[PDB]
Design a protein around this ligand. Sequence first.
Ligand SMILES: CCCc1cc(=O)[nH]c(Nc2ccccc2F)n1
Length: 464
Amino acid sequence: FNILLATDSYKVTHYKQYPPNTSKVYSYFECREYEETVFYGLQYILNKYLKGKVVTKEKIQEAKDVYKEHFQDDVFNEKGWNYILEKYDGHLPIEIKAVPEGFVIPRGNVLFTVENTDPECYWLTNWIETILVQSWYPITVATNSREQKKILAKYLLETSGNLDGLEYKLHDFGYRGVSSQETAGIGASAHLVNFKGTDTVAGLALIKKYYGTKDPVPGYSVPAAEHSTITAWGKDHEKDAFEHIVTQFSSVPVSVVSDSYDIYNACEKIWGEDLRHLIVSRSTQAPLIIRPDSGNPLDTVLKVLEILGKKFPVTENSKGYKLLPPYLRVIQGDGVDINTLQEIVEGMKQKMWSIENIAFGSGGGLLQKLTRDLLNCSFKCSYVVTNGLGINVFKDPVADPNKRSKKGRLSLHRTPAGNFVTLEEGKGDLEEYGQDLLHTVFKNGKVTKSYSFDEIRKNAQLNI
Ligand SMILES: CCCc1cc(=O)[nH]c(Nc2ccccc2F)n1
């Protein structure tokens, strides 16, 4: 990894564009006015890419050679990068202040600030905008996942009277559905801030290495089938596939994809009749989990439950909601996103089915169908020191007031009613509010404050 080759190309030319005699460039990140966001991911970036000796004579030579061909001109700031190498042993003269990880902050608030600590490195602040702005992705995954936890919490409490097993209601199925191995690890770790169920194994190593838990692992899984392990038996032998799989995992929970040919036939005739004796004998700690995996997600879930409800002993819980026996459950993991998740639980409640009957799996909806525009994650310069004088800078495009940026030195505070406020123009210096919630997490190539994955999960908890 070479940080000199880890920026937007045009940023290579920006050192020549700042007003002459600029000693400071101060920038901040926000999720411009999903009312509140989970701040998560920055610590990974600081350790992986920004800390320690990030500049060497070889990295300067490599960047110089690439940029000469890429621009068909000499525009690369070799003197600037050589200054960092010689003065600071390749350590970045940068200071990063950030809200603690796991913190749930409303939109339009300062989340982190970036500034150079050496006047010669005025251009460095925004060189690292590209790398830091990528924090939009763990923030958006964590926020979107927590928003789904809110819907699940609401319907589970309404239909069962408690939140038992809530942390296992939304399982990460997204490993294949993401853009890369690195994305898989980041995205799966962001989902684990809110839930305990994951199939994206990559998230586990990321958490262990960069964050850490008291528990051996942050996430869990159970044995399960795929279309290949069912279909390999042959179309006429689907019952043999089902029987072999539940017998192999007779003492632990097991999920079986039952839609290879006919989901409704599998539920009513295979599970409901032919193999019913292998299901009713299962323990409460080892249920059979039936997975439908095609068709309209709501219509399939409702039809599956109605079939099962007629083949198996159904009870009525204390809230008046239908409950399948404890050895039988359902998992819907096809076409699941925040919108379809809301449709399914609402449809289930209307048909008097308890939410304890179902669990969800989400792949692309959880980890990939997200963009930087969803929470309007933005990095902008708010303050500059030129000719020894600090000036408050901002953008204010005529055609879009939403793109108006914050002015001057920023700080984050708790208001008297316990809400949040971002103070602009250095007004935090007048101690009218509390202590600034931003902490220095990075300074001069060193990580100065870190959080465990346990602290992050505690910070990101739902009020309930
Ligand atoms: C309940 C956790 C175990 C489980 C149950 C299940 O039916 N499927 C899976 N995983 C899965 C399915 C489709 C795509 C990608 C995936 F990782 N894991």
